[PDB]
């Protein structure tokens, strides 16, 4: 009925995908009642820079909730390291990074 928010991307998670294909990048989210405002950012060195005006959605499958970043389609430059983030109470929660490998 009540729990803390978790953005539980596992450490060293990666995906490799064909350029020109659609892709759905998943942020597994644990929440209990009050669905968090999850955002995506892409790593530029030390900084995780928030992604603006991107297509996002929510997915639920076998009692797991995912926040999705859509790539329609993947481009070569989409290569890199991504994190999901959310405010919970007065905390900023940040997931481990997930790495994308695009085959050009």
């Amino acid at each position: 009925e009540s729990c803390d928010v978790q953005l539980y991307i596992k450490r060293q998670s990666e995906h490799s995908i064909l350029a020109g294909d659609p892709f759905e990048l998943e942020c597994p989210v644990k929440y209990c009642a009050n669905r968090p405002h999850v955002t995506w950012c892409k790593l530029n060195g030390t900084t995780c820079v928030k992604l603006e005006d991107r297509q996002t959605s929510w997915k639920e499958e076998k009692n797991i909730s995912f926040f999705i970043l859509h790539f329609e389609p993947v481009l070569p430059n989409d290569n890199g390291s991504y994190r999901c983030s959310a405010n919970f109470q007065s905390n900023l929660i940040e997931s481990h990074s997930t790495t994308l490998y695009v085959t050009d």
Partner: antibody
Amino acid sequence: QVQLVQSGAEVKKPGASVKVSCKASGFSLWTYAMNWVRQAPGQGLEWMGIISDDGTTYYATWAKGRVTMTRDTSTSTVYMELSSLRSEDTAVYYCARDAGAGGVQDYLTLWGQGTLVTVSS
Amino acid sequence: DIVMTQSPDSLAVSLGERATINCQASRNIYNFLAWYQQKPGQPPKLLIYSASTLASGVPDRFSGSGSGTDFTLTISSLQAEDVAVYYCQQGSSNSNIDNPFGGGTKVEIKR
């Protein structure tokens, strides 16, 4: 308890703007996002957009460039401004508390009483 | 865009009989689907969220089912106070969408 109290009925001429307010009681604008929804007389519910925990706004396609959603977190008040009013904007404008913190609307758990805006010569 | 379609437009059921109304999404919205009841001159009231969870205080004659793109609200035995307009609403995305609400279904007593 938790309440939403909206500003009073407005009467507007074609071409005017309107700014409707919605004062929230008993929760923070950082906990639950606010949605704006309108309804023309005898018609369906039309979602206009959502203002998130951190103030980020997302709008229905038709509402982009017409609707501006703002907030003042010190009073827990949210605002909906609609520009270049036309007779077909005549509607009851509702604020509604989201179950969630924003980004994507989740579902709506609490409604304001609505504000009638009549646009006419 | 995710287009939400309700059917039928209106439904007439005799007092005490079963009322079933449909909501369809143009693309997969999983279980991010809520149902509302609205009476004349009132704001909508939430009945069901996550496709099938009854909101606090809602009579258990109300039930929701479905997942993906096909959803139903069922009133097992229609009562006078159930005469209303019912809306479904998707909570999966708002990326370039027109309306997360369906167009509504009017439920009336058949006599």
